[PDB]
Design a protein around this ligand. Structure first.
Ligand SMILES: CC(C)CN(C1CC1)S(=O)(=O)c1cnn(C)c1
Lengths: 237, 300
């Protein structure tokens, strides 16, 4: 059933699984109209579908045209997410199809279950983890490809860059969640930590800077400090 | 007016006949029930004084044969059986009527309750839900499971209600996932009404029979079925107006008849709040909403 702290190593076993996060699928800016009413304007979004073992990220870009003339967009967005995840599964060869799909928000369970009726052996699971995948649009290259899209588009990334050459998927996922938690809590300070030093660059084929093992430990410490900090600035402790 | 005679009453038992019930003491001289209205199905049911485990009973229609009850001391229950010898059976009953050892089916003339609860129920359909073709009558009890329950174990003792499952390929057209899940009208009208039941009368018949098995036997799977058939209509944006009007009457009399003390277990809060307050038909069940609010305001 639900994924939580007790069954956390399951994420890194050899059963193919995907996390699905819909928090950036339907995105809007809220503004005033000439008459002084409020209106929304959609901007491009994305489904964040991640294999936590391999790092493979299936970034389905949701172009604003998919909302045109549609009602109840927040509810449609869950079903559009489910439709696209289902289409992704069918596009994969059988031996690449997930055995489990974990949704980060419980509201996705029925839409995805209904879209996946053709796959009765694929388990659709919620999670009690508060995962920070909403902050994926704080990763500059992901944000850039979403905003530039002029049509629906799937873009494939490895969200771990080359880290798995040197660390395990458990450690890589922990690093990712720490970076994303930091970026979610204080994006400016997080990005300052990541880029302050111009001698460390991001490879054209990567998302994150080319830190050595020792530099990653410094970075990881800075990000914890930042999280605990903000947690102080927030609560006054 | 027809009669279901009893050979004897060897064990103390509460006997029900439709919505009526009376206590029979151990070896009390009881020889059955007379003046049973022709034109309706009926259910005669039993709860033993010594073991309230297993309410059980028989659905029957007196137009289809002469039925009586004999206590079987080996299997330990009151059994319905069908006598073929008309003259022998009538003669005994005739004679039994003379010694006044029968209770009278106690219908108040003003009262349409039973008709209203069984309006669409037909023995022929009961016998397809309850499969035992050598008998004209149908046995049901507390513990019998439904076909759907078994999918999630003895097939011959099952209640073969129509399987309804909102997250199934039957309910959901490929490519209309969201449409069909939020508006079940396709599933109600094409799959179930046109496809499986053929008309709304058979649908209501099964719905009413499910309710009655839930109420009289505490049959939990029947209660599941009754609520599913309600929820399928309420969750459909497009329902014939005559069905909605009839549904309101059906449910009104079911809510009216339900023992007040059994509401906690027989009534699904989620389904009812959804149907009366959130569903497409939230405004189409005036009588049912009024009786539910005055009688079970807690549930809501
Ligand atoms: C309550 C009575 C009507 C039950 N009998 C009906 C006429 C069949 S009986 O004649 O006493 C009877 C009981 N067992 N068998 C084989 C016959």
């Amino acid at each position: 059933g639900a994924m939580n702290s007790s069954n956390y190593a399951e994420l890194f076993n050899n059963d193919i699984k995907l996390f699905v996060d819909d928090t950036n699928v339907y995105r809007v800016t809220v503004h005033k109209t000439f008459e002084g009413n409020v209106a929304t304007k959609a901007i491009n979004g994305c489904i964040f579908t991640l294999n936590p073992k391999t790092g493979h990220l299936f970034l389905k870009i949701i172009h604003t045209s998919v909302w045109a003339g549609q009602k109840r967009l927040s509810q449609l967005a869950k079903w559009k997410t489910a439709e696209e995840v289902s289409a992704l599964v069918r596009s994969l060869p059988k031996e690449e199809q997930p055995k489990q799909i974990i949704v980060t928000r419980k509201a996705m369970l029925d839409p995805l279950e209904v879209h996946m009726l053709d796959f009765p052996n694929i388990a659709i699971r919620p999670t009690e983890l508060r995962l920070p995948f909403s902050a994926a649009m704080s990763i500059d290259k992901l944000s850039d490809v979403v905003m530039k899209a002029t049509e629906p588009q799937m873009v494939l990334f490895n969200i771990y860059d080359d880290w798995l050459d040197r660390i395990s998927s458990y450690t890589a996922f922990s690093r990712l969640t720490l970076l994303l938690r930091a970026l979610k809590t204080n994006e400016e300070s997080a990005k300052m930590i990541l880029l302050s030093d111009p001698t460390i660059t991001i490879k054209s084929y990567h998302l994150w800077p080319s830190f050595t093992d020792e530099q990653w430990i410094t970075i990881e410490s800075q990000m914890r400090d930042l999280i605990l900090t903000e947690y102080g600035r927030k609560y006054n402790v | 007016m027809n009669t279901v005679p009893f050979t004897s009453a060897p064990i103390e038992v509460t006997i029900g006949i439709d919505q009526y019930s009376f206590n029979v003491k151990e070896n009390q001289p009881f020889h059955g029930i007379k003046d049973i209205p022709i034109g309706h199905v009926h259910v005669i049911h039993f709860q033993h004084a010594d073991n309230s485990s297993m309410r059980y009973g028989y659905w029957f229609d007196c137009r289809m044969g002469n039925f009586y009850i004999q206590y079987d001391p080996k299997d330990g229950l009151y059994k319905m059986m069908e006598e073929r010898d008309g003259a022998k059976f009538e003669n005994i009953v005739h004679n039994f009527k003379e010694r006044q050892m029968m209770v009278s089916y106690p219908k108040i003339d003003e009262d349409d309750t039973w008709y209203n609860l069984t309006e669409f129920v037909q023995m022929d359909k009961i016998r397809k839900i309850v499969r035992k073709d050598e008998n004209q009558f149908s046995y049901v009890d507390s513990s019998m499971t439904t076909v759907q329950e078994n999918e999630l174990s003895d097939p011959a003792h099952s209640l073969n209600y129509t399987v309804i499952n909102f997250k199934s390929r039957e309910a959901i057209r490929p490519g209309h996932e969201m449409e069909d899940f939020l508006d079940k009208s396709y599933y109600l009208n094409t799959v179930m009404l046109q496809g499986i039941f053929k008309n709304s009368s058979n649908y209501f018949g099964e719905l009413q029979f499910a309710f009655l098995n839930a109420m009289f036997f505490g049959n939990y799977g029947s209660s599941l079925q009754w609520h599913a058939m309600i929820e399928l209509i309420c969750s459909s944006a497009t329902v014939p107006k005559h069905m909605l009007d009839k549904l309101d009457e059906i449910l009104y009399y079911q809510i009216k008849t339900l023992p007040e003390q059994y509401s906690d277990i027989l009534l699904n809060e989620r389904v009812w709040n959804i149907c009366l307050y959130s569903s497409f038909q939230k405004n189409s069940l005036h009588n049912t909403e009024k009786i539910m609010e005055n009688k079970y305001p807690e549930l809501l």
